[PDB]
Symmetry: C2
Subunit: 392 residues, 2 copies
């Protein structure tokens, strides 16, 4: 009598960042004093001129289907953003507007990956990279890194993991969860390895491109232009303009790949919310001021948090270059107390002092925790006080 | 030099509804005198109370991540809409809000179907049914119907199509492209066959449920409530409330299937645009004044269009029960003028008098065309004058 389900969903698990978020929302909605230091979104509202454009779009009758791959105003804005921000040249047939940055990745895997294809994924990785590979029947090949490398892979590791079967790699810099960015010198060394394997497609996820303070943002294509013809660039307005719930991402890459991704999209979501596309145009075509103000605040919150974590015995802290995440290791605490792993550390801490985090093993790096400083410094000081009490 | 693309994407060919829409848009954009008769979307704005609710959600800052399967106000409004409209009972863990009703269908295939699984699809079909089945490596099993059977399958056809590997059926009533609705009598005769094959999931697509005039709407569960355990109901607001651009659909069925579909969604789009969800809450909880207003206009247009198509020699026409489509056969003309098929008929009609419509072959019924009367009652009088001048 029991309904049998698709073998492909048994291979993955539901988003565990989103499960921590939903655990804490529901505990909060039941009256409990919980603090969700595992946020995926800033504490700023969408800037006012983006709102007025979405409102104004609703009043004009922009409530219809559009080109599946995005209205021309949006694709133009994207084209000009890649020229003016990243000195990359893309035609409009190389651009695809999608329903969040996550879908861009999902379309890429469905559009490109065949059963058994191996995808190099550096750990610590964004939770969804292996699940999106697995849903397309690819094989995640994880490269584990340590604080002794500031959580960045190196050329001999990469060459070691590459195989005749490997057909894609994800490079995510600035990284969710670590907050670390590859310098240009370092990206050059990785491109050198990659130019020797022409069958490998390079997916650079630049979603945190503007949330960076230790250096100006660079990506693999600035470092090694030679790889242009086999790189998809993935990006979005989610984090740079606090438009998380608007669900607008975008991508640029080789025309045949973009057309295939568009094929998957026309058969799953068709076009994104047309009101949200209009909002996105206002964002990309607007001034970066609300960015600079947001990023300055994230930076001062980051320094506050990193220094708080430094004062807690048993916590080894690696400072981020960007994003609103920091990824310290609680391994010393796990060992002295006898917990199985960072999951138990996370469950105990939630249950004892009400701080909800994402355990590092959800990202492939056991013994760490992911802390988001995308909330106000008052929430931060409270939560870190609670984490300090727990670690005593 | 060239990027190789995934085998699954080679199984699907571009949508013919999307290609007619885009080709007519270039022809109007160059200045030719084109009338579009192949839109899949009403010519009404989104009603004011929905628009107001969305604007107010923008100003209120509901611009962040929600629960992946939808805000609880919208899930409750779906629960009550199913109880109120269709006398079906569903709990919140049986309901999933998706990025358009197309995504509900896509999530369903990815969550349910295993490679080799056969899915029964009555012809004429919505053009996306077989593509979505193939993208999940399932195998479409078309039941072909004739204008004489009013383009409906009978019990004998459904029994002869079922095999050990039949796992799903799509029942789309009222139908895109035909406009025909099954009666409760005919559905029960179908449910009686399905009762003898418990392994078949039933996917009833009721997106056009309110766009009906020939009879009260009923679906397979009003006909055979016993099938409740193995039926998922797909719906949405795109067609009833003129909200295609908003990208909100919803589904109700068995909790373990709804949860796998949620898993797929959590790894592809996350939650749909939070602004659209509030707009959807206003639509479902609102009055039905917009719909009755829209639907009677469509009834008036259909009746005019149908009366017209009878008077044209060589055209046989079956009147519609609803939707904004009519699906008449031009086969007598293809023979007479020696055309290859409805495709050559459709390019020649668009070349000669600039009427854009969709050939019946795209929905799997050679020799018909889909006319859509979701345009002005004035524009329709002209479209149909051009149609004699082509056919007479």
């Amino acid at each position: 009598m029991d309904i049998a389900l698709a073998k492909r969903v048994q291979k993955v698990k539901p988003s565990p960042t989103l499960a921590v978020a939903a655990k804490a929302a529901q505990m909060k909605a039941q009256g409990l004093d919980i603090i969700g230091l595992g946020t995926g979104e800033p504490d700023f509202d969408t800037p006012q001129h983006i709102k007025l454009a979405a409102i104004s779009a609703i009043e004009a009758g922009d409530t219809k289907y559009t080109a599946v791959d995005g209205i021309v105003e949006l694709k133009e804005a994207v084209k000009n953003k890649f020229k003016r921000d990243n000195e990359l040249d893309y035609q409009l047939n190389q651009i695809l507007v999608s329903v969040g940055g996550k879908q861009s990745c999902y379309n890429l895997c469905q559009a490109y990956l065949n059963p058994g294809d191996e995808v190099i994924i550096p750990a610590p990785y964004w939770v969804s990279y292996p699940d999106m590979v697995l849903l397309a029947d690819g094989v995640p090949v994880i490269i584990e890194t340590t604080p002794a490398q500031r959580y960045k892979i190196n050329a001999q590791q990469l060459e070691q993991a590459i195989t005749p079967k490997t057909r894609m790699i994800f490079l995510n810099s600035p990284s969710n969860p670590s907050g670390i960015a590859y310098t240009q010198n370092e990206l050059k060394e990785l491109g050198d390895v990659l130019k020797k394997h022409p069958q490998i497609l390079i997916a650079t996820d630049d979603m945190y491109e503007h949330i960076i303070w230790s250096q100006p943002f660079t990506n693999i294509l600035n470092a090694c232009p030679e790889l242009y013809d086999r790189t998809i660039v993935l990006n979005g307005v989610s984090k740079a303009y606090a438009m998380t719930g608007w669900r607008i991402g975008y991508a640029a890459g080789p025309a045949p790949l973009i057309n295939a991704m568009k094929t998957i999209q026309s058969q799953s979501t068709s076009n994104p919310c047309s009101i949200a596309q209009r909002a996105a145009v206002a964002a990309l075509n607007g001034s970066n001021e609300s960015i600079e103000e947001m990023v300055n605040a994230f930076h001062q919150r980051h320094d506050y948090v990193a220094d708080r974590l430094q004062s807690i015995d048993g916590i080894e802290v690696i400072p981020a270059d960007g994003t609103f995440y920091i990824f310290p290791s609680v391994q010393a605490i796990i060992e002295k107390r006898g917990y199985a792993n960072d999951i138990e550390f996370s469950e105990k801490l939630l249950n004892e002092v009400g701080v909800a985090l994402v355990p590092g093993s959800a990202f492939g790096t056991e013994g760490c925790i992911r802390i988001s400083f995308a909330t106000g410094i008052d929430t931060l000081k409270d939560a870190l006080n609670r984490l300090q009490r727990f670690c005593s």
